[PDB]
Curated annotation (Swiss-Prot), chain A:
Belongs to the complement C6/C7/C8/C9 family. It is linked to Complement component 6 deficiency: A rare defect of the complement classical pathway associated with susceptibility to severe recurrent infections, predominantly by Neisseria gonorrhoeae or Neisseria meningitidis. All cysteine residues are assumed to be cross-linked to one another. Individual modules containing an even number of conserved cysteine residues are supposed to have disulfide linkages only within the same module. This is Complement component C6. Residues 80-110 form the EGF-like domain. It comes from the Eukaryota. Glycans are attached at W125, W128, W131. The chain holds residues 444 to 590 of 934 of the full protein.
Swiss-Prot record, chain B:
It is linked to Complement component 7 deficiency: A rare defect of the complement classical pathway associated with susceptibility to severe recurrent infections, predominantly by Neisseria gonorrhoeae or Neisseria meningitidis. This is Complement component C7. Component of the membrane attack complex (MAC), a multiprotein complex activated by the complement cascade, which inserts into a target cell membrane and forms a pore, leading to target cell membrane rupture and cell lysis. The MAC is initiated by proteolytic cleavage of C5 into complement C5b in response to the classical, alternative, lectin and GZMK complement pathways. The complement pathways consist in a cascade of proteins that leads to phagocytosis and breakdown of pathogens and signaling that strengthens the adaptive immune system. C7 serves as a membrane anchor. The chain holds residues 249 to 298 of 843 of the full protein. The gene is C7. C-, N- and O-glycosylated. O-glycosylated with core 1 or possibly core 8 glycans. It is found in: Secreted; Target cell membrane. Belongs to the complement C6/C7/C8/C9 family.
From Swiss-Prot, chain E:
Glycans are attached at W8, W11, T17, W69. The gene is C6. It comes from Homo sapiens (Human). Its main location: secreted. This is Complement component C6. GO terms for biological process: complement activation; complement activation, classical pathway; in utero embryonic development; innate immune response; killing of cells of another organism; positive regulation of immune response. Residues 1-58, 60-113 form the TSP type-1 domain. Keywords: Complement pathway, Cytolysis, Disulfide bond, EGF-like domain, Glycoprotein, Immunity, Innate immunity, Membrane, Membrane attack complex, Repeat, Secreted, Signal, Sushi, Target cell membrane, Target membrane, Transmembrane, Transmembrane beta strand. The chain holds residues 22 to 246 of 934 of the full protein.
Length: 147, 50, 99, 49, 225, 149
């Protein structure tokens, strides 16, 4: 359970599940979720857009753009070994963690529920190759195989 | 044989600031103040102990 | 921070010594820190796995009235000025395994 | 710092991350797996000789 | 059949340490008049095999060596030094225990050129936040200092009630580490009201929530997504 | 435990919650606001490494039955896994499922080579015990190298 309030959420999670949804319990929980929601989905925008009303704002904004470039380059989860069961690798600092598809569990999604029959392997991106030397139009380019 | 392995988290997280902006506790700062400024491992070990 | 109405000198509260009933502001309407935020300031011994003693002052309010409403506890709490975030979304994670 | 120093900026993304939410949905996830396995054997045998 | 009449062997040692090996045990069947007569051929499991060591094989951290020290930062006086992960630890491999960035005191060769905010007419909070003069003596606390409010002998009309904040409204303002998929520090002050009470009902029975300035719209539909 | 009581406890933990999950920063990073703070920060870092040496479970010769040896001051206790007991955990039986064998444990790091060519190097052997009977190899690198202090 993510979101809601501890008592009702506890109630729910402690439900064995032998008969599926405890409708009462669930209801209670969902009212608590109205009281205390959790983030389900979102649209990101880069934090450097916020460096807007400070001394040297434009200088620090451009520095932090540069920074975020470098930082991505250095800590992108592309450099993780692929997670099993087409989980998503993520790189918190210097440890890669796997975010598991629903129907896969264990610390690194290593084992899968009876319903996860699908053996399809999703093609996560490789790391960007280095920028090529400037072409006949003075454009550099870089590519990631997706391999 | 039962196993129950069970967590409730309800402070989804705290994130402490970086060491620059953290405020040290008075007794901890006092113990840092009394560290000998030299590798007397007895003192630093008493620090890591507490 | 002197005579804030808040103890910003961690142990001694010397910034609040002998200062006027006029000078101390209603700096914030609430002083109640989140229910165990003191534990977030303990040191940790990674070999023994034990939490050790108080290392960070997690109730340094910095003169701010940084209220947060906990939907879980359904109460207003005052965060310290330093803490980057403190949030109350619950996660409950149950393994039963009977054999 | 005013001058670019990769470390001290990187700290920024350590502390606050790289993006903020322009929009999103809040709510709750209920995710349950229950799995019951059971197996019985009976044997009965009688001989008269 | 009563198959426990033929106890299993102990489990065979797992075929592999770290990549989902298989271990098996078999019943010590002895063929006997009991086995012949009691359908023990038809309805006993004669061997059992299961998963073992399904935990993925640990990958240990490798760190590169540090680059050169930074040039000395004039306003920080603390040149940095950095190194890179050559591979991250994962699947429970040895963590990158050493520090990834180092800092050292230095004496700058150059002076600072940073400037005060000096934001003209806008009210400079003690924090140095600049807020609309409208908000000076707002009757609220838009600096958090209350520095907008300290000397205000008269205050603008506060809204008629202390409306509740929106549920978990601060989550909407935490920064997000896209590379890590995890929330980070508070980036938007969804507490700041801008001296107005825009207010929204989740339901007409509810006490309305106060919509903070940073949110342009808020919806309270319930959806089974 | 019955539903109601777990309910109530999971409520109460709202009010007296404990740190159940953490990410850690070395304590020397806080060495600040004090005379010689810059120097004390290095001596504290060296003290952390000396202490992790002194209390490294490497010193503890293995416990049977996967008992985790831990240095408690001068001496190692074996924390036997459930329903195993005795000085080594040599006695009783493990409940639940085990992959079997003996898992390999690291020897203590050899002393640092004195940063020759500016690189220190040190080695450990994974002989404490050698992984046996199909137990898993010790987890970690055999050697480390660091820049000289
Ligand atoms: C937040 O929730 C609102 C209420 O459900 C959404 O508005 C609705 O959107 C649907 C689809 O466009 C309309 O049919 C309906 O009339 C109402 O406008 C709103 O889109 C949603 N916010 C976001 C960002 O999706």
């Amino acid at each position: 359970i993510r979101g809601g309030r501890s008592e009702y959420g506890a109630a729910l999670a402690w439900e064995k599940g032998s008969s599926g949804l405890e409708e009462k319990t669930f209801s209670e929980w969902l009212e608590s979720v109205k009281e205390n929601p959790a983030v389900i989905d979102f649209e990101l925008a880069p934090i450097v857009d916020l460096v807007r009303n400070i001394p040297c704002a434009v200088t620090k904004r451009n520095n932090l753009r540069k920074a975020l470039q470098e930082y991505a380059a250095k800590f992108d989860p592309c450099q993780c070994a692929p997670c099993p069961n087409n989980g998503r690798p993520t790189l918190s600092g210097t440890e890669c963690l796997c975010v598991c598809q629903s129907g896969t569990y264990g610390e690194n999604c290593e084992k899968q529920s009876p319903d996860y029959k699908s053996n399809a392997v999703d093609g996560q991106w490789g790391c960007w190759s280095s920028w090529s030397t400037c072409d006949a139009t003075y454009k550099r380019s870089r590519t990631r195989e997706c391999n | 044989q039962l196993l129950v392995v069970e967590n409730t988290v309800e402070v989804a997280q705290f994130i402490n600031n970086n060491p620059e902006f953290l405020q040290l506790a008075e007794p901890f700062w006092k113990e840092l103040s009394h560290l000998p400024s030299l590798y007397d491992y007895s003192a630093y070990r008493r620090l890591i102990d507490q | 921070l002197v005579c804030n109405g808040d103890s910003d000198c961690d142990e001694d509260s010397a910034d609040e010594d002998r200062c006027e009933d006029s000078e101390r502001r209603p700096s914030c309407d609430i002083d109640k820190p989140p229910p165990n935020i003191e534990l977030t300031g303990n040191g940790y011994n990674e070999l023994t796995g034990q939490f050790r003693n108080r290392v960070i002052n997690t109730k340094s309010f910095g003169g701010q009235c940084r209220k947060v409403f906990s939907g879980d506890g359904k109460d207003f709490y005052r965060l310290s000025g330093n803490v980057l975030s403190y949030t109350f979304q619950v996660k409950i994670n149950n393994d039963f395994n009977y054999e | 710092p005013l001058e670019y120093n990769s470390a001290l900026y990187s700290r920024i993304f350590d502390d606050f991350g790289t993006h903020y939410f322009t929009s999103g949905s809040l709510g709750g996830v209920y995710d349950l797996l229950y799995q019951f396995s059971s197996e019985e054997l009976k044997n009965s045998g009688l001989t008269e000789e | 059949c009563f198959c426990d009449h033929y106890a299993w062997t102990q489990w065979t040692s797992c075929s592999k340490t770290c990549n989902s090996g298989t271990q098996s045990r078999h019943r010590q069947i002895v063929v006997d008049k009991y086995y012949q007569e009691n359908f023990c051929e038809q309805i006993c499991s004669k061997q059992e095999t299961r998963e073992c060591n399904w935990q993925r094989c640990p990958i240990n951290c490798l760190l590169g060596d540090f680059g050169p020290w930074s040039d000395c930062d004039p306003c920080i006086e603390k040149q940095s030094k950095v190194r890179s992960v050559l591979r991250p630890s994962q699947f429970g491999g040895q963590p990158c225990t050493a520090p990834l960035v180092a800092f050292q005191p230095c004496i700058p060769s150059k002076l600072c050129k940073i400037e005060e905010a000096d934001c003209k007419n806008k009210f400079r909070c003690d924090s140095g936040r600049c807020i609309a003069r409208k908000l000076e003596c707002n009757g609220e606390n838009d600096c958090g200092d209350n520095s907008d409010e300290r000397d205000c002998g008269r205050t603008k009309a506060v809204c008629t009630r202390k409306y509740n904040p929106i549920p978990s409204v601060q989550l909407m303002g935490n920064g997000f580490h896209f590379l890590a998929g995890e929330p980070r520090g508070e980036v938007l002050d969804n507490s700041f009201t801008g001296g107005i009470c825009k207010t929204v009902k989740s339901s007409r029975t509810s006490n309305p929530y106060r919509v903070p300035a940073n949110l342009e719209n808020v919806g309270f539909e319930v959806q089974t997504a | 435990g019955n539903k109601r009581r777990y309910s109530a406890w999971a409520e109460s933990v709202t009010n007296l919650p404990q740190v159940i999950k953490q990410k850690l920063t070395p304590l020397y990073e806080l060495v600040k606001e004090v005379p010689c703070a810059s120097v004390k920060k290095l001596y504290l870092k060296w003290a952390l490494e000396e202490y992790l040496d002194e209390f490294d479970p490497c010193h503890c010769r293995p416990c049977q039955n996967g008992g985790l040896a831990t240095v408690e001051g001068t001496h190692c206790l074996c924390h036997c896994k459930p329903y195993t007991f005795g000085a080594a955990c040599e006695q009783g039986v493990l409940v639940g499922n085990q992959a079997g064998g003996v898992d390999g444990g690291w020897s203590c790091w050899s002393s640092w080579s004195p940063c020759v060519q500016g690189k220190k190097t040190r080695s450990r052997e994974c002989n404490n015990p050698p992984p046996s009977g199909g137990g898993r190899s010790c987890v970690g690198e055999t050697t480390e190298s660091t820049q000289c202090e």
